[PDB]
Amino acid sequence: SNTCDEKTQSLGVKFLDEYQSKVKRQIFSGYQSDIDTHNRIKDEL
Amino acid sequence: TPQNITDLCAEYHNTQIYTLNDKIFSYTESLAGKREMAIITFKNGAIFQVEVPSSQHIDSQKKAIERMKDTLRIAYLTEAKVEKLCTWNNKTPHAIAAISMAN
Amino acid sequence: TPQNITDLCAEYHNTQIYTLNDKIFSYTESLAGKREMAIITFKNGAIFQVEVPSSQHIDSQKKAIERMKDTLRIAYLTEAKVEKLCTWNNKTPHAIAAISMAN
Amino acid sequence: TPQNITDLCAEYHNTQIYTLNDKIFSYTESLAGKREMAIITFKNGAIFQVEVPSSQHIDSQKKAIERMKDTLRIAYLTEAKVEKLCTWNNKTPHAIAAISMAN
Amino acid sequence: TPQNITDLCAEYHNTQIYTLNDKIFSYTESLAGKREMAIITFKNGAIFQVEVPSSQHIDSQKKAIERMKDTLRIAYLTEAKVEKLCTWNNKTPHAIAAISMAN
Amino acid sequence: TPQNITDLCAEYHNTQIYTLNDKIFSYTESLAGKREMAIITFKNGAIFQVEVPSSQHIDSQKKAIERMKDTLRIAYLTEAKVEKLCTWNNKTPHAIAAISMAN
Amino acid sequence: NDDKLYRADSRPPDEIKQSGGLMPRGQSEYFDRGTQMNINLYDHARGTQTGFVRHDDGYVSTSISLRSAHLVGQTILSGHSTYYLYVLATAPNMFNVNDVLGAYSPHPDEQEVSALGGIPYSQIYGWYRVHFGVLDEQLHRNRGYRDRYYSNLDIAPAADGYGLAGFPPEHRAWREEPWIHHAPPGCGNAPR
């Protein structure tokens, strides 16, 4: 009933969320890639 | 040398292992005198701290703490999943000693 | 120690906590002599600054400002959601003291 | 303090503002001693540099020079979107002294 | 000058390349005194380190190690394919001494 | 001032500018003591180096040698695509003097 | 693998970058976790088509071959001389509608692959420009498109999709194979 119609969404949203985490992680990690490197030894000596 | 974080964490007395196996929920960074530290939170509750580079530290550490606040945040923007937390539990909040990130 | 931006900030006489739950609208940066700061805006007006290193600033605070302009830039490109800022308001534009990113 | 790049550019006597509102067409960086800088251009045809440090660069803005060379690269890559620059007209190519980012 | 990770590694002793044409499984970063390390784990249960400095190192080293700890992190987040890997097998875990990222 | 890479390069001698017009196939990072370089390789099979921050370099240069090794590693990790590379032909592998990126 | 998919969209490439890619209907920025649409394949699969190739109920539809994707849009988006055809790397957020619904697919022939949530700009490999109906074979490569990463991925095993299918609560499928072992809670169920 409500549970099923509801449950699909619980499920669909859940699915969409984890996938967003791989895209962001790959686009996001990359930008900060060697930026985050200028961040390290220039930054601690 | 440990080959894992668990073997590392008991070489220290006053440590504790935390499997969180999840992504950081929120991240705070401070620059307000004496309160220059980072603060991490989990969905489930857990707040963890990278400590103010006080005197509990050897000089070798100072620059490993800056790499550590960098790692949280990179992992915070990135959304990676932290799987394990090595932490000193004799502080409040708990104090990060090491982090594990396996895919 | 402090365990959140609220508690953290509430530990000073001249600071306030701004609640934004929004993303950085513009990112200004200067290398110019005297003004080597960073300005961050908001669509519903918020304007803040990451002050220049000075007296009012120790040694501990100096790295912290440097590693906070690192964090605005990427909070900006990354398109991040800014939760709450703890600002030293005896200034204009208010200076950032603390940032907390959540979601 | 100034809450703009405009009013910020205004503080100086041989600077001008640049409303581009485009993304860096190119990005070059030399490491070649006596020329450790960076030039960046716009499709419109525009050129600018990030000056090879010193004597006129107070000790302070060295750290700032460097910040902005990192800002120039990551904007290129990430697909930029710079609003305006604040250039010094004493030189050709005009030198960058500050930048806005609007998204 | 050596022309690829292979002829490079060969100048040194107690080394051996390792093909992997893979990616990283784990990332482990410690800050605990005596332990400012990073341990790399490959999906086929392989473990490697990035050692704590100087004893056998050169100061020209100390910044390298600091770039390595760097690289891997975002070698990991990104998802790698650490082609091959030079290593001091005369170690245990085996000490990373070079890395090769292959399309 | 060199208002582009083409000029810039010929400012020097012991050089030659290559239009690579491509993204980077591989990346090697050494940590080997007395071997602290970056090595870029192309599809066409064109090898390059970022000189071990060797004794033939102007202090200013020292800071330059590092950033470069950084433009490499994020252009790589991001399949950015170089335009040209100004390089020293007096070395094998022909060291990198500067880089451009467009389109 | 290095498989590419197709989608004849009108929306400009400039407004996509802005958007974060190609979105379903009622999504504007790709990263809203709190900007929720209905996420349903069943409903998705059977929307009618007012002036857009199917992009309702939390998915965006692709075509597996161009000619196809172009046949389908200058059949639709006809009225516009201008439109683009976006080439799209394959990733595991892509459901083969047919392989999901099976019998119950509202339009087999039509063979769609569907991105749950939409296609992030990084996915979009580049595009064609559609002028005066007739296609323009010149390719506009896409910065933002990660090749190492995408030539390494493929579409999600259909069985990932069995739980997401979205048949009405008392629909036959929920008590048949394969759905019966994948069926969300309160979905058809064990009883009836």
JSON list of N, CA and C in Angstrom, two decimals, chain C residues 31-93:
[
{"chain": "C", "resi": 31, "resn": "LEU", "atom": "N", "xyz": [46.10, 39.59, -3.63]},
{"chain": "C", "resi": 31, "resn": "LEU", "atom": "CA", "xyz": [47.53, 39.37, -3.36]},
{"chain": "C", "resi": 31, "resn": "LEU", "atom": "C", "xyz": [48.17, 40.76, -3.06]},
{"chain": "C", "resi": 32, "resn": "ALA", "atom": "N", "xyz": [47.37, 41.79, -3.27]},
{"chain": "C", "resi": 32, "resn": "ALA", "atom": "CA", "xyz": [47.75, 43.20, -3.16]},
{"chain": "C", "resi": 32, "resn": "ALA", "atom": "C", "xyz": [48.38, 43.55, -1.83]},
{"chain": "C", "resi": 33, "resn": "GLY", "atom": "N", "xyz": [49.33, 44.48, -1.87]},
{"chain": "C", "resi": 33, "resn": "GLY", "atom": "CA", "xyz": [50.09, 44.85, -0.63]},
{"chain": "C", "resi": 33, "resn": "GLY", "atom": "C", "xyz": [49.10, 45.42, 0.36]},
{"chain": "C", "resi": 34, "resn": "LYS", "atom": "N", "xyz": [49.19, 45.00, 1.60]},
{"chain": "C", "resi": 34, "resn": "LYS", "atom": "CA", "xyz": [48.29, 45.43, 2.67]},
{"chain": "C", "resi": 34, "resn": "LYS", "atom": "C", "xyz": [47.00, 44.63, 2.73]},
{"chain": "C", "resi": 35, "resn": "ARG", "atom": "N", "xyz": [46.34, 44.43, 1.60]},
{"chain": "C", "resi": 35, "resn": "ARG", "atom": "CA", "xyz": [45.08, 43.67, 1.50]},
{"chain": "C", "resi": 35, "resn": "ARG", "atom": "C", "xyz": [45.32, 42.26, 0.93]},
{"chain": "C", "resi": 36, "resn": "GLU", "atom": "N", "xyz": [45.81, 41.34, 1.70]},
{"chain": "C", "resi": 36, "resn": "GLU", "atom": "CA", "xyz": [46.00, 39.95, 1.15]},
{"chain": "C", "resi": 36, "resn": "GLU", "atom": "C", "xyz": [45.05, 39.04, 1.92]},
{"chain": "C", "resi": 37, "resn": "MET", "atom": "N", "xyz": [43.79, 39.18, 1.51]},
{"chain": "C", "resi": 37, "resn": "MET", "atom": "CA", "xyz": [42.64, 38.53, 2.15]},
{"chain": "C", "resi": 37, "resn": "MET", "atom": "C", "xyz": [41.82, 37.75, 1.10]},
{"chain": "C", "resi": 38, "resn": "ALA", "atom": "N", "xyz": [40.65, 37.38, 1.53]},
{"chain": "C", "resi": 38, "resn": "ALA", "atom": "CA", "xyz": [39.65, 36.68, 0.77]},
{"chain": "C", "resi": 38, "resn": "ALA", "atom": "C", "xyz": [38.26, 37.07, 1.23]},
{"chain": "C", "resi": 39, "resn": "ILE", "atom": "N", "xyz": [37.46, 37.51, 0.28]},
{"chain": "C", "resi": 39, "resn": "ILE", "atom": "CA", "xyz": [36.06, 37.87, 0.58]},
{"chain": "C", "resi": 39, "resn": "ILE", "atom": "C", "xyz": [35.07, 36.86, -0.02]},
{"chain": "C", "resi": 40, "resn": "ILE", "atom": "N", "xyz": [34.14, 36.46, 0.83]},
{"chain": "C", "resi": 40, "resn": "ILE", "atom": "CA", "xyz": [33.05, 35.57, 0.53]},
{"chain": "C", "resi": 40, "resn": "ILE", "atom": "C", "xyz": [31.69, 36.25, 0.73]},
{"chain": "C", "resi": 41, "resn": "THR", "atom": "N", "xyz": [30.84, 36.07, -0.27]},
{"chain": "C", "resi": 41, "resn": "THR", "atom": "CA", "xyz": [29.49, 36.71, -0.29]},
{"chain": "C", "resi": 41, "resn": "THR", "atom": "C", "xyz": [28.40, 35.68, -0.09]},
{"chain": "C", "resi": 42, "resn": "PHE", "atom": "N", "xyz": [27.18, 36.07, -0.32]},
{"chain": "C", "resi": 42, "resn": "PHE", "atom": "CA", "xyz": [25.94, 35.28, -0.16]},
{"chain": "C", "resi": 42, "resn": "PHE", "atom": "C", "xyz": [24.86, 36.00, -0.98]},
{"chain": "C", "resi": 43, "resn": "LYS", "atom": "N", "xyz": [23.86, 35.27, -1.44]},
{"chain": "C", "resi": 43, "resn": "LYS", "atom": "CA", "xyz": [22.85, 35.84, -2.39]},
{"chain": "C", "resi": 43, "resn": "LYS", "atom": "C", "xyz": [21.83, 36.71, -1.64]},
{"chain": "C", "resi": 44, "resn": "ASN", "atom": "N", "xyz": [21.68, 36.36, -0.39]},
{"chain": "C", "resi": 44, "resn": "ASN", "atom": "CA", "xyz": [20.82, 37.10, 0.55]},
{"chain": "C", "resi": 44, "resn": "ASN", "atom": "C", "xyz": [21.83, 37.68, 1.58]},
{"chain": "C", "resi": 45, "resn": "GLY", "atom": "N", "xyz": [22.59, 38.61, 1.01]},
{"chain": "C", "resi": 45, "resn": "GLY", "atom": "CA", "xyz": [23.59, 39.47, 1.41]},
{"chain": "C", "resi": 45, "resn": "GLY", "atom": "C", "xyz": [24.83, 39.23, 2.17]},
{"chain": "C", "resi": 46, "resn": "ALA", "atom": "N", "xyz": [25.04, 38.08, 2.79]},
{"chain": "C", "resi": 46, "resn": "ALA", "atom": "CA", "xyz": [26.20, 37.85, 3.67]},
{"chain": "C", "resi": 46, "resn": "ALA", "atom": "C", "xyz": [27.53, 38.18, 3.03]},
{"chain": "C", "resi": 47, "resn": "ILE", "atom": "N", "xyz": [28.33, 38.97, 3.73]},
{"chain": "C", "resi": 47, "resn": "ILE", "atom": "CA", "xyz": [29.70, 39.35, 3.35]},
{"chain": "C", "resi": 47, "resn": "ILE", "atom": "C", "xyz": [30.65, 39.09, 4.50]},
{"chain": "C", "resi": 48, "resn": "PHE", "atom": "N", "xyz": [31.71, 38.35, 4.27]},
{"chain": "C", "resi": 48, "resn": "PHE", "atom": "CA", "xyz": [32.63, 37.98, 5.36]},
{"chain": "C", "resi": 48, "resn": "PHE", "atom": "C", "xyz": [34.05, 38.09, 4.84]},
{"chain": "C", "resi": 49, "resn": "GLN", "atom": "N", "xyz": [35.05, 38.03, 5.71]},
{"chain": "C", "resi": 49, "resn": "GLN", "atom": "CA", "xyz": [36.45, 38.19, 5.29]},
{"chain": "C", "resi": 49, "resn": "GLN", "atom": "C", "xyz": [37.30, 37.20, 6.11]},
{"chain": "C", "resi": 50, "resn": "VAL", "atom": "N", "xyz": [38.43, 36.92, 5.52]},
{"chain": "C", "resi": 50, "resn": "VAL", "atom": "CA", "xyz": [39.50, 36.09, 6.11]},
{"chain": "C", "resi": 50, "resn": "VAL", "atom": "C", "xyz": [40.67, 37.11, 6.19]},
{"chain": "C", "resi": 51, "resn": "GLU", "atom": "N", "xyz": [40.78, 37.65, 7.38]},
{"chain": "C", "resi": 51, "resn": "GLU", "atom": "CA", "xyz": [41.70, 38.73, 7.73]},
{"chain": "C", "resi": 51, "resn": "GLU", "atom": "C", "xyz": [43.13, 38.48, 7.30]},
{"chain": "C", "resi": 52, "resn": "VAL", "atom": "N", "xyz": [43.86, 39.57, 7.28]},
{"chain": "C", "resi": 52, "resn": "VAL", "atom": "CA", "xyz": [45.33, 39.56, 7.05]},
{"chain": "C", "resi": 52, "resn": "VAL", "atom": "C", "xyz": [46.05, 39.27, 8.38]},
{"chain": "C", "resi": 53, "resn": "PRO", "atom": "N", "xyz": [47.14, 38.54, 8.23]},
{"chain": "C", "resi": 53, "resn": "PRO", "atom": "CA", "xyz": [47.98, 38.11, 9.36]},
{"chain": "C", "resi": 53, "resn": "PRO", "atom": "C", "xyz": [48.65, 39.34, 9.96]},
{"chain": "C", "resi": 54, "resn": "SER", "atom": "N", "xyz": [48.54, 39.40, 11.27]},
{"chain": "C", "resi": 54, "resn": "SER", "atom": "CA", "xyz": [48.87, 40.56, 12.11]},
{"chain": "C", "resi": 54, "resn": "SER", "atom": "C", "xyz": [49.10, 40.25, 13.59]},
{"chain": "C", "resi": 55, "resn": "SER", "atom": "N", "xyz": [49.17, 41.38, 14.30]},
{"chain": "C", "resi": 55, "resn": "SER", "atom": "CA", "xyz": [49.12, 41.37, 15.79]},
{"chain": "C", "resi": 55, "resn": "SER", "atom": "C", "xyz": [47.59, 41.10, 15.96]},
{"chain": "C", "resi": 56, "resn": "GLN", "atom": "N", "xyz": [47.25, 40.44, 17.04]},
{"chain": "C", "resi": 56, "resn": "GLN", "atom": "CA", "xyz": [45.88, 39.88, 17.19]},
{"chain": "C", "resi": 56, "resn": "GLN", "atom": "C", "xyz": [46.03, 38.41, 16.74]},
{"chain": "C", "resi": 57, "resn": "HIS", "atom": "N", "xyz": [47.14, 38.18, 16.02]},
{"chain": "C", "resi": 57, "resn": "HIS", "atom": "CA", "xyz": [47.45, 36.84, 15.57]},
{"chain": "C", "resi": 57, "resn": "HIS", "atom": "C", "xyz": [48.80, 36.36, 16.06]},
{"chain": "C", "resi": 58, "resn": "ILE", "atom": "N", "xyz": [48.76, 35.19, 16.70]},
{"chain": "C", "resi": 58, "resn": "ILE", "atom": "CA", "xyz": [49.99, 34.49, 17.08]},
{"chain": "C", "resi": 58, "resn": "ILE", "atom": "C", "xyz": [50.50, 33.72, 15.84]},
{"chain": "C", "resi": 59, "resn": "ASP", "atom": "N", "xyz": [51.26, 32.73, 16.14]},
{"chain": "C", "resi": 59, "resn": "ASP", "atom": "CA", "xyz": [51.92, 31.76, 15.28]},
{"chain": "C", "resi": 59, "resn": "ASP", "atom": "C", "xyz": [50.98, 30.63, 14.87]},
{"chain": "C", "resi": 60, "resn": "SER", "atom": "N", "xyz": [50.19, 30.19, 15.83]},
{"chain": "C", "resi": 60, "resn": "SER", "atom": "CA", "xyz": [49.19, 29.14, 15.71]},
{"chain": "C", "resi": 60, "resn": "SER", "atom": "C", "xyz": [48.08, 29.56, 14.74]},
{"chain": "C", "resi": 61, "resn": "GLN", "atom": "N", "xyz": [47.61, 30.77, 14.88]},
{"chain": "C", "resi": 61, "resn": "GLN", "atom": "CA", "xyz": [46.60, 31.44, 14.08]},
{"chain": "C", "resi": 61, "resn": "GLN", "atom": "C", "xyz": [47.06, 31.75, 12.65]},
{"chain": "C", "resi": 62, "resn": "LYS", "atom": "N", "xyz": [48.37, 31.76, 12.43]},
{"chain": "C", "resi": 62, "resn": "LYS", "atom": "CA", "xyz": [48.87, 32.16, 11.10]},
{"chain": "C", "resi": 62, "resn": "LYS", "atom": "C", "xyz": [48.74, 31.13, 10.04]},
{"chain": "C", "resi": 63, "resn": "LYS", "atom": "N", "xyz": [48.97, 29.88, 10.38]},
{"chain": "C", "resi": 63, "resn": "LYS", "atom": "CA", "xyz": [48.79, 28.72, 9.50]},
{"chain": "C", "resi": 63, "resn": "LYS", "atom": "C", "xyz": [47.28, 28.59, 9.23]},
{"chain": "C", "resi": 64, "resn": "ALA", "atom": "N", "xyz": [46.54, 28.61, 10.33]},
{"chain": "C", "resi": 64, "resn": "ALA", "atom": "CA", "xyz": [45.09, 28.53, 10.35]},
{"chain": "C", "resi": 64, "resn": "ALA", "atom": "C", "xyz": [44.38, 29.46, 9.39]},
{"chain": "C", "resi": 65, "resn": "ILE", "atom": "N", "xyz": [44.91, 30.60, 9.06]},
{"chain": "C", "resi": 65, "resn": "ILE", "atom": "CA", "xyz": [44.21, 31.56, 8.17]},
{"chain": "C", "resi": 65, "resn": "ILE", "atom": "C", "xyz": [44.48, 31.17, 6.70]},
{"chain": "C", "resi": 66, "resn": "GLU", "atom": "N", "xyz": [45.70, 30.66, 6.57]},
{"chain": "C", "resi": 66, "resn": "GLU", "atom": "CA", "xyz": [46.26, 30.21, 5.32]},
{"chain": "C", "resi": 66, "resn": "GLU", "atom": "C", "xyz": [45.46, 28.98, 4.90]},
{"chain": "C", "resi": 67, "resn": "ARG", "atom": "N", "xyz": [45.23, 28.11, 5.86]},
{"chain": "C", "resi": 67, "resn": "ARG", "atom": "CA", "xyz": [44.45, 26.86, 5.62]},
{"chain": "C", "resi": 67, "resn": "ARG", "atom": "C", "xyz": [42.97, 27.09, 5.86]},
{"chain": "C", "resi": 68, "resn": "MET", "atom": "N", "xyz": [42.45, 28.21, 5.39]},
{"chain": "C", "resi": 68, "resn": "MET", "atom": "CA", "xyz": [41.05, 28.60, 5.63]},
{"chain": "C", "resi": 68, "resn": "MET", "atom": "C", "xyz": [40.62, 29.35, 4.38]},
{"chain": "C", "resi": 69, "resn": "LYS", "atom": "N", "xyz": [41.64, 29.84, 3.69]},
{"chain": "C", "resi": 69, "resn": "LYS", "atom": "CA", "xyz": [41.49, 30.43, 2.34]},
{"chain": "C", "resi": 69, "resn": "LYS", "atom": "C", "xyz": [41.60, 29.28, 1.31]},
{"chain": "C", "resi": 70, "resn": "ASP", "atom": "N", "xyz": [42.07, 28.15, 1.78]},
{"chain": "C", "resi": 70, "resn": "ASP", "atom": "CA", "xyz": [42.23, 26.90, 1.00]},
{"chain": "C", "resi": 70, "resn": "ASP", "atom": "C", "xyz": [40.84, 26.23, 0.87]},
{"chain": "C", "resi": 71, "resn": "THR", "atom": "N", "xyz": [40.15, 26.30, 1.97]},
{"chain": "C", "resi": 71, "resn": "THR", "atom": "CA", "xyz": [38.86, 25.83, 2.33]},
{"chain": "C", "resi": 71, "resn": "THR", "atom": "C", "xyz": [37.69, 26.66, 1.87]},
{"chain": "C", "resi": 72, "resn": "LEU", "atom": "N", "xyz": [37.87, 27.95, 1.77]},
{"chain": "C", "resi": 72, "resn": "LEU", "atom": "CA", "xyz": [36.82, 28.76, 1.06]},
{"chain": "C", "resi": 72, "resn": "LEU", "atom": "C", "xyz": [36.87, 28.55, -0.43]},
{"chain": "C", "resi": 73, "resn": "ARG", "atom": "N", "xyz": [37.99, 28.79, -1.08]},
{"chain": "C", "resi": 73, "resn": "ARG", "atom": "CA", "xyz": [38.22, 28.50, -2.52]},
{"chain": "C", "resi": 73, "resn": "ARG", "atom": "C", "xyz": [37.50, 27.22, -2.92]},
{"chain": "C", "resi": 74, "resn": "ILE", "atom": "N", "xyz": [37.89, 26.04, -2.42]},
{"chain": "C", "resi": 74, "resn": "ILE", "atom": "CA", "xyz": [37.26, 24.79, -2.74]},
{"chain": "C", "resi": 74, "resn": "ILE", "atom": "C", "xyz": [35.83, 24.63, -2.26]},
{"chain": "C", "resi": 75, "resn": "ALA", "atom": "N", "xyz": [35.46, 25.31, -1.19]},
{"chain": "C", "resi": 75, "resn": "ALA", "atom": "CA", "xyz": [34.06, 25.21, -0.72]},
{"chain": "C", "resi": 75, "resn": "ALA", "atom": "C", "xyz": [33.22, 25.85, -1.85]},
{"chain": "C", "resi": 76, "resn": "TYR", "atom": "N", "xyz": [33.91, 26.76, -2.51]},
{"chain": "C", "resi": 76, "resn": "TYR", "atom": "CA", "xyz": [33.31, 27.56, -3.57]},
{"chain": "C", "resi": 76, "resn": "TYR", "atom": "C", "xyz": [33.21, 26.81, -4.90]},
{"chain": "C", "resi": 77, "resn": "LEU", "atom": "N", "xyz": [34.32, 26.30, -5.38]},
{"chain": "C", "resi": 77, "resn": "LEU", "atom": "CA", "xyz": [34.32, 25.54, -6.64]},
{"chain": "C", "resi": 77, "resn": "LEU", "atom": "C", "xyz": [33.49, 24.27, -6.44]},
{"chain": "C", "resi": 78, "resn": "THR", "atom": "N", "xyz": [33.81, 23.59, -5.35]},
{"chain": "C", "resi": 78, "resn": "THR", "atom": "CA", "xyz": [33.13, 22.34, -4.97]},
{"chain": "C", "resi": 78, "resn": "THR", "atom": "C", "xyz": [31.63, 22.57, -4.89]},
{"chain": "C", "resi": 79, "resn": "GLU", "atom": "N", "xyz": [31.24, 23.83, -4.75]},
{"chain": "C", "resi": 79, "resn": "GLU", "atom": "CA", "xyz": [29.87, 24.29, -4.64]},
{"chain": "C", "resi": 79, "resn": "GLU", "atom": "C", "xyz": [29.22, 24.03, -3.30]},
{"chain": "C", "resi": 80, "resn": "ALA", "atom": "N", "xyz": [29.97, 23.59, -2.32]},
{"chain": "C", "resi": 80, "resn": "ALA", "atom": "CA", "xyz": [29.61, 23.21, -0.98]},
{"chain": "C", "resi": 80, "resn": "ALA", "atom": "C", "xyz": [28.54, 24.00, -0.28]},
{"chain": "C", "resi": 81, "resn": "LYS", "atom": "N", "xyz": [27.96, 23.34, 0.72]},
{"chain": "C", "resi": 81, "resn": "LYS", "atom": "CA", "xyz": [26.92, 24.00, 1.53]},
{"chain": "C", "resi": 81, "resn": "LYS", "atom": "C", "xyz": [27.53, 24.42, 2.85]},
{"chain": "C", "resi": 82, "resn": "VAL", "atom": "N", "xyz": [27.47, 25.74, 3.05]},
{"chain": "C", "resi": 82, "resn": "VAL", "atom": "CA", "xyz": [27.95, 26.32, 4.30]},
{"chain": "C", "resi": 82, "resn": "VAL", "atom": "C", "xyz": [26.79, 26.42, 5.29]},
{"chain": "C", "resi": 83, "resn": "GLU", "atom": "N", "xyz": [27.08, 25.84, 6.45]},
{"chain": "C", "resi": 83, "resn": "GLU", "atom": "CA", "xyz": [26.11, 25.72, 7.51]},
{"chain": "C", "resi": 83, "resn": "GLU", "atom": "C", "xyz": [26.06, 27.03, 8.32]},
{"chain": "C", "resi": 84, "resn": "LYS", "atom": "N", "xyz": [26.95, 27.12, 9.26]},
{"chain": "C", "resi": 84, "resn": "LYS", "atom": "CA", "xyz": [27.19, 28.10, 10.30]},
{"chain": "C", "resi": 84, "resn": "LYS", "atom": "C", "xyz": [28.66, 28.59, 10.29]},
{"chain": "C", "resi": 85, "resn": "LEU", "atom": "N", "xyz": [28.82, 29.90, 10.33]},
{"chain": "C", "resi": 85, "resn": "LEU", "atom": "CA", "xyz": [30.11, 30.60, 10.45]},
{"chain": "C", "resi": 85, "resn": "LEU", "atom": "C", "xyz": [30.16, 31.27, 11.84]},
{"chain": "C", "resi": 86, "resn": "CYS", "atom": "N", "xyz": [31.27, 31.21, 12.52]},
{"chain": "C", "resi": 86, "resn": "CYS", "atom": "CA", "xyz": [31.45, 31.95, 13.82]},
{"chain": "C", "resi": 86, "resn": "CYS", "atom": "C", "xyz": [32.32, 33.17, 13.46]},
{"chain": "C", "resi": 87, "resn": "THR", "atom": "N", "xyz": [31.73, 34.36, 13.52]},
{"chain": "C", "resi": 87, "resn": "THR", "atom": "CA", "xyz": [32.43, 35.58, 13.11]},
{"chain": "C", "resi": 87, "resn": "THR", "atom": "C", "xyz": [32.81, 36.51, 14.25]},
{"chain": "C", "resi": 88, "resn": "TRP", "atom": "N", "xyz": [34.01, 37.04, 14.13]},
{"chain": "C", "resi": 88, "resn": "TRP", "atom": "CA", "xyz": [34.50, 38.11, 15.06]},
{"chain": "C", "resi": 88, "resn": "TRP", "atom": "C", "xyz": [33.85, 39.41, 14.47]},
{"chain": "C", "resi": 89, "resn": "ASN", "atom": "N", "xyz": [32.82, 39.93, 15.09]},
{"chain": "C", "resi": 89, "resn": "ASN", "atom": "CA", "xyz": [32.07, 41.06, 14.57]},
{"chain": "C", "resi": 89, "resn": "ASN", "atom": "C", "xyz": [32.50, 42.44, 15.01]},
{"chain": "C", "resi": 90, "resn": "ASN", "atom": "N", "xyz": [33.67, 42.55, 15.60]},
{"chain": "C", "resi": 90, "resn": "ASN", "atom": "CA", "xyz": [34.14, 43.92, 15.96]},
{"chain": "C", "resi": 90, "resn": "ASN", "atom": "C", "xyz": [34.77, 44.49, 14.70]},
{"chain": "C", "resi": 91, "resn": "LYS", "atom": "N", "xyz": [34.55, 43.75, 13.59]},
{"chain": "C", "resi": 91, "resn": "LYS", "atom": "CA", "xyz": [35.14, 44.13, 12.28]},
{"chain": "C", "resi": 91, "resn": "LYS", "atom": "C", "xyz": [34.12, 44.35, 11.19]},
{"chain": "C", "resi": 92, "resn": "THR", "atom": "N", "xyz": [34.61, 44.86, 10.06]},
{"chain": "C", "resi": 92, "resn": "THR", "atom": "CA", "xyz": [33.84, 45.15, 8.89]},
{"chain": "C", "resi": 92, "resn": "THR", "atom": "C", "xyz": [34.78, 45.01, 7.67]},
{"chain": "C", "resi": 93, "resn": "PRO", "atom": "N", "xyz": [34.52, 44.05, 6.82]},
{"chain": "C", "resi": 93, "resn": "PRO", "atom": "CA", "xyz": [33.46, 43.03, 6.88]},
{"chain": "C", "resi": 93, "resn": "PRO", "atom": "C", "xyz": [33.83, 42.06, 8.03]}
]
